[PDB]
A paper describes a structure:
The Klebsiella jumbo myophage ϕKp24 displays an unusually complex arrangement of tail fibers interacting with a host cell. We observe the tail fibers are branched and rearranged dramatically upon cell surface attachment. This complex configuration involves fourteen putative tail fibers with depolymerase activity that provide ϕKp24 with the ability to infect a broad panel of capsular polysaccharide (CPS) types of Klebsiella pneumoniae. In this study, we combine cryo-electron microscopy methods, protein structure prediction methods, molecular simulations, microbiological and machine learning approaches to explore the capsid, tail, and tail fibers of ϕKp24. We determine the structure of the capsid and tail at 4.1 Å and 3.0 Å resolution.
Residue numbers in the entry:
A (entry chain A): 415 to 689
B (entry chain L): 1 to 689
The structure:
Amino acid sequence: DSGFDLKTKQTIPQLIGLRADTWIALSTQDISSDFNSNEEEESIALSLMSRVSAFPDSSDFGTPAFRGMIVGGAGYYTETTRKLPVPLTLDRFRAYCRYAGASDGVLKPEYAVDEGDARKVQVVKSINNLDKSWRVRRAQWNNNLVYVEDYDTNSQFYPGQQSFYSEQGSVLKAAIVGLCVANLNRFAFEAWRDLTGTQKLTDDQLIERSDDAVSTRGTGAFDDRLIFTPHSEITQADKERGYSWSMRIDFGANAFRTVMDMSSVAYTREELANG
Amino acid sequence: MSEQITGSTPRIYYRGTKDSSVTRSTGSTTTLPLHRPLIMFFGQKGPTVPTWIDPVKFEDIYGSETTNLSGVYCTHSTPFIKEAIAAGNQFMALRLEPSDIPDVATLGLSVDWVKTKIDDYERNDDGTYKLDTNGDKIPLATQIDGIKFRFVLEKIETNESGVSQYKKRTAKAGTIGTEATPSTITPLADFRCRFKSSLGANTALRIWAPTINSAQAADADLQARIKSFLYRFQILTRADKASSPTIFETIYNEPSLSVGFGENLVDPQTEVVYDFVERIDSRYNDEDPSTYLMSPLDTPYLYQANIDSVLTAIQELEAPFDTVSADEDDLYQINLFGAQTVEGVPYHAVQILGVLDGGVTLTETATNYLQGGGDGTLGNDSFNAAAYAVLSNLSNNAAFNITNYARYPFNAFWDSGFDLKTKQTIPQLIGLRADTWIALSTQDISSDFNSNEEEESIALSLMSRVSAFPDSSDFGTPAFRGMIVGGAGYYTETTRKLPVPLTLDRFRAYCRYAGASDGVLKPEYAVDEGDARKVQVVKSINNLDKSWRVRRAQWNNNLVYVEDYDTNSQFYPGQQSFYSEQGSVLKAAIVGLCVANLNRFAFEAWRDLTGTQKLTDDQLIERSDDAVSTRGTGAFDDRLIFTPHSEITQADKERGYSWSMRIDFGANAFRTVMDMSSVAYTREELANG
């Protein structure tokens, strides 16, 4: 979302309902209007979350959707002399283009979107509402928004880049894992496209070739964010039907720690030096 | 002398002799020293939010009149600002304003416009030299139908609700030629001051239309190449209502600009833009943090519809006439403020009413000043009021939240003599922030010097206030980040009699010691050794004849006080902090600032490590310690010895998203008492045996 009005913002979420290999980034800003206040940010966030809740990941079991994220904030584009407002989705878009856009389909370790100089804002300035209160920041975090903070007097950084998954699962808490899963869903389609409609196959060859395809395509591509494993077979319902086979992927991921403590104790110089 | 650089023709141009011009000084990249103070003050211009500043640029960010002790902006913190600038501390400025400050200065331009028959004058030749009965000849034609103008420059009036009409002026009935109603005032442009101060009331502007004969000769080739008449624009500023103006040059060191009416006046031969507002705003301003300068004028506004209508009217009238081009695009060539083309041929059928007729003469010598504005009510009383307004409302201020560690790197606050009501809102800084340090004073600079009993009473009250913000709310450790300094005197670095407290002297000492931009304490300025332990910027201190009981009581109550070194000078027998317990680790005051810096280093470690997908527990733990030790080692000049330890305790295992750090540090104290005794010996039994 590059800044569509709120009427158009509410027709985008249906992509992650109509397709199983799609990933959406939403913006809480309308570039044709004034920079929003904290209350308007919260209201638009709630409205977008309500819209998104209508497209569960699994309709059979009602898994909450997790492919995408919502980013709040706005500023001015730095790569031009003119005055041209933009939302922070532009900065995240540039980061992702550099990270996961290589023509050879393997993630670049040198552009990790949350390590080094990629975790700071780079193409936006004069961001707004940077004096959020603790309660406002806590509310946004609990509503699963992605927001920036001040790094130093000159710049900003992302304390944590999470997706709009609403549950307590720690597997689906990073936004990049959603893109990885979308790619897995694409690989499964490729396997089917290759194996469909062949006269002389046997069931064992079909089952073996599906797993071979998915594993060969996926292994070595995700820069160690995921670990996955496919399994193809022919269940009893497939035996009954006679023209279908099943595949099922098992995958796992991690999360990230975000809180630190601080304490001190005063010693005399001698007992601290030796004792 | 007069003609300007038009092109590449071989030539040497002489710009005459001139007197020296002030040159704006370039600044350097900002850093974090160990001493990072916040200073609130009244100013002439500049932003009204906290700003991290390198002292080289204070003069040209906040105007050079704010540091003048004899000016109107002097308050009880100007000495602090001057000392900071002298020592070279990158510090955080906060410009306050009085609660009754007026709005900005404004000036609108308009033309009184009418049509009527007028006279016509003789002509010597096609040059159309003759005018106004020059020579000996009466005007020739009986009556020539034409147009009458009368220019007006005046303040832009506000709405009845109290809102300016900066962009919302409208035409009205005129006054010249009232025999015909259509005499109308129509607006042409608006100008507004950028800041809220007397600088706007003293700012002035000039606009004129030159010809080939001017002191700044124009060129017809450029106007032919891009069809638009070029006007000269100039900005001036004066010191006070009685002084004389001085030209405010552009960032390229020029006295005036050439501008023109139209959409985009781009020159193909050189790619230069002659648009009015764009050119003015781009040439007179410079926002680069290292070379920073803002023009007193804001961005001009222009009434395109009305200017276009008047140009169209005059073109339709006289463009198809004897001595003016009739083409369509000549509309923007039409000379409006003058009455002639670039070559200097007068427009007959146009009459501009002069001064005696109630008009304004737009020439290079006329000057026009913005109307309105002001600074407000200045002085120590209003300064204290504003400071209290800011300090009391810290948890719900809509201007800025100062619990933001990353955005507001200040770590010290010195009491320069605020009144007792404002004094009691300062201690909460070391309650709201864990990397802050405060110095307090027992003297209200606007009152008479306190006596011994008043000193004691104020000290007790401040201690009681400080007792409400313990360092560790969990275990109730008493606060130790700061100190209280008692005494007052007079400032020595000026002829005027200007009382100041001794917090100023200790402020200068700390600035010199812990103010290096590379973040390392300077051993040659140790605040308690050599010549830095004497009073240097205060004289005629009071209550120097304290009795032994009074001195003992003050020491027990944890004040910092001075004594007589010799017949001429004073010194500090011991500079302790307001820690109220018996521990000898936290007895010195500089150690408190060292500990504040340690707390800052912890925040930096967190900021760098937070929120990473692919880290492990061991790497997180190791990197935290690496950061803290690498940052802090070798900077505290042997005042402290510290050691960090990160880990993931059982509570962290439960939570799954947190890790812990703990720093162990140790320090020393000082001796203050000596005994004395003697024994008498005979010369022999003393010399041998």
